Amino acid sequence: VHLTPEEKSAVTALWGKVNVDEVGGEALGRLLVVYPWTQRFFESFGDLSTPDAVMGNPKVKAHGKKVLGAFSDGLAHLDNLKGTFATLSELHCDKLHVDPENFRLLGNVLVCVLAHHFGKQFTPPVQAAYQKVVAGVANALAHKYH
Amino acid sequence: VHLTPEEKSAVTALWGKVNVDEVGGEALGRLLVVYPWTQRFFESFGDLSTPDAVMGNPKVKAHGKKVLGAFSDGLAHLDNLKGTFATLSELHCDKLHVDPENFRLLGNVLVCVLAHHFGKQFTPPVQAAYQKVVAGVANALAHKYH
Amino acid sequence: VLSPADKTNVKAAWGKVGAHAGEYGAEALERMFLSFPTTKTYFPHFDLSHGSAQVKGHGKKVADALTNAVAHVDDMPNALSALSDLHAHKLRVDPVNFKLLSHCLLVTLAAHLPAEFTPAVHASLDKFLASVSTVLTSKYR
Amino acid sequence: VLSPADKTNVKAAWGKVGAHAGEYGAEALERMFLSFPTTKTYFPHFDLSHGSAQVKGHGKKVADALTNAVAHVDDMPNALSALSDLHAHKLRVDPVNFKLLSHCLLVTLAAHLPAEFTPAVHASLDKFLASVSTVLTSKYR
Numbered sequence A, B: 001v002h003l004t005p006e007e008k009s010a011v012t013a014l015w016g017k018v019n020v021d022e023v024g025g026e027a028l029g030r031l032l033v034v035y036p037w038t039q040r041f042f043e044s045f046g047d048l049s050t051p052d053a054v055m056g057n058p059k060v061k062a063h064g065k066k067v068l069g070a071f072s073d074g075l076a077h078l079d080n081l082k083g084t085f086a087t088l089s090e091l092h093c094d095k096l097h098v099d100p101e102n103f104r105l106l107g108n109v110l111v112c113v114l115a116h117h118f119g120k121q122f123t124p125p126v127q128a129a130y131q132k133v134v135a136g137v138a139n140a141l142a143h144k145y146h
Numbered sequence C, D: 001v002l003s004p005a006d007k008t009n010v011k012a013a014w015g016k017v018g019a020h021a022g023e024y025g026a027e028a029l030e031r032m033f034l035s036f037p038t039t040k041t042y043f044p045h046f047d048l049s050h051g052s053a054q055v056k057g058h059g060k061k062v063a064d065a066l067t068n069a070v071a072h073v074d075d076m077p078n079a080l081s082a083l084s085d086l087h088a089h090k091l092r093v094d095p096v097n098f099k100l101l102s103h104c105l106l107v108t109l110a111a112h113l114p115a116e117f118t119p120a121v122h123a124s125l126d127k128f129l130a131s132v133s134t135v136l137t138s139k140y141r
């Protein structure tokens, strides 16, 4: 995935300041609040019928830290996203039936969350390098689908 | 841009029945009619205000030919769509300023036109195979956009 | 925004379908599943193999919904309300997939109605399927 | 459709934009051009460098239009009439690019509104920018 090492370094510098625990829950929860259709995969998480209900929902914070943890590992592997995510892609396709469109939604929700969290530090060139990254991740997670 | 051996054979065999002149003008005119904002590029072509105007327009027919002619040549090189189309890609970006989105809408119209021309011979499998070609072409035309 | 032109286009092309609606409905879905595998994620409880009755069954319900939309073209939101509730609150298909199906509908009807599938009718049917899509996806949030 | 909560959320957030609206629009567009370089195909006549006067002028124009829509949230098609006509018949930007700019607006708002960019408010702005976009794209065909 085409990241210059000016882009590489900027993704890297920023990600280090990220509370993966907290950003994960935020992203997943906003995902579920902003684009409620994505709730369809999370019936088993209990109450998601309001914003406050989704945002404080323990299983959402917990799934988000897991989603972001795995996103976080991908960053060490920008050279080999397909590889890093092959097994998760199969998991999402064959076991979970997650339409890969969701990975795009989440990627954008994530870029919003980083904006919110880093403010002016989330400069347009840093955002651009995150859009490449988030798109790269959504394609790798989609690539084992059939 | 991967086709199984029998998809490559299905695609190659249909295409040998295709008259690039007729199909090209049909696909392009339809593009102009069904998604009239794609007209933005062809103000030089004349009056495009109505379907008969568009489908009779002789510049539209000529261009359709040209477009489908280069599309035809790339069927020859399904294995290297990027290299084959790199120069048209940089042209469409740096010269023509054509939103690559247009390459996708064109591929879908082309698929419709093929179905319409061939009827029942355009079986679900042969479509799926063409949907792959048409997407690969669009991504090859989109690749040198910067 | 369906012009009167369009409704006429849609009514006519849809008139010509008639009894094969559900057959076309079925073929659109399987053209979908093969062209856009991603759409399968919403049918994990279907046997999706060729010639399946589940798909022909579903194919027919989709066709009947459309035939219902064509007849109440002027008031789709109300004629379709039960369906838009169900997509919003139960099925929750990402909006992107409505364009996949609509394209496959269009391909199906072109393959079947060669003489009626005019550039104009093509445009109209395209707008018609977007409008049905928009109604189906109307209550999502 | 926008509920009363939505309207309130948007007016509240837009109220916070206050006099930064044009700065925000220029920033959203710069974000857009760098994240989505295909959107630059619509600005070949522009100087697309950080800081360019043209992006700044266009930013302000975009932000003003949006300020107008917030004020007319109940009357958008009429409020944005010149603008939908202009985009439908003259600019003719493919409808996909609306959702790219919408994204970058939302990112820009998020970078600037630490206190108010709540999840509910986020959902509200997202729906609002989707409504604006549906308006501006209303008369495409």
Ligand code: HEM
Pocket: A038, A039, A041, A042, A063, A066, A067, A068, A070, A071, A088, A091, A092, A096, A098, A102, A103, A106, A107, A137, A141
């Ligand atoms: C940024 C992209 C994503 C990554 C890296 C990711 C990663 C993961 C991981 C690590 C797991 C747990 C794997 C395991 O069971 O061992 C998982 C499961 C799961 N994912 Fe994804 N995920 C992503 C996006 C999404 C999205 C956008 C959705 C849908 C809205 C989704 C739906 C699910 C569901 C329903 C599970 C199983 C939850 C459960 O029952 O515990 N994922 N994913």
Ligand code: HEM
Pocket: B038, B041, B042, B063, B066, B067, B068, B070, B071, B088, B091, B092, B096, B098, B102, B103, B106, B137, B141
């Ligand atoms: C399969 C997709 C396409 C291919 C293979 C293709 C190919 C070509 C070729 C071979 C040329 C002329 C080469 C030259 O003059 O140097 C051309 C020019 C052009 N193309 Fe594309 N094209 C494609 C799609 C599109 C689409 C969808 C549009 C817009 C809706 C578009 C807009 C144009 C325009 C405006 C020109 C310049 C024509 C002129 O000045 O007469 N193309 N294209």
Ligand code: HEM
Pocket: C039, C040, C042, C043, C058, C061, C062, C065, C066, C083, C086, C091, C093, C097, C098, C099, C101, C102, C132, C133, C136
């Ligand atoms: C023109 C667009 C569509 C129409 C008219 C339509 C219509 C219908 C109808 C009438 C039903 C029957 C509901 C019932 O009474 O059980 C249904 C169900 C369903 N649809 Fe939609 N639909 C459309 C698009 C889509 C798309 C694009 C997808 C995603 C690929 C989708 C996924 C589903 C699923 C999973 C069900 C439930 C099927 C089952 O389990 O029985 N739909 N649709």
Ligand code: HEM
Pocket: D039, D040, D042, D043, D058, D061, D062, D065, D066, D083, D086, D087, D091, D093, D097, D098, D099, D101, D102, D132, D133, D136
């Ligand atoms: C919320 C979405 C948008 C809003 C509110 C908006 C608003 C505006 C406004 C106020 C103008 C200036 C009208 C005038 O000249 O008086 C304009 C022009 C323009 N917009 Fe849109 N716009 C939007 C989306 C887009 C998108 C997504 C694109 C392409 C990616 C685009 C391309 C253009 C172009 C090319 C112009 C003409 C610029 C010039 O030649 O100076 N617009 N827009």
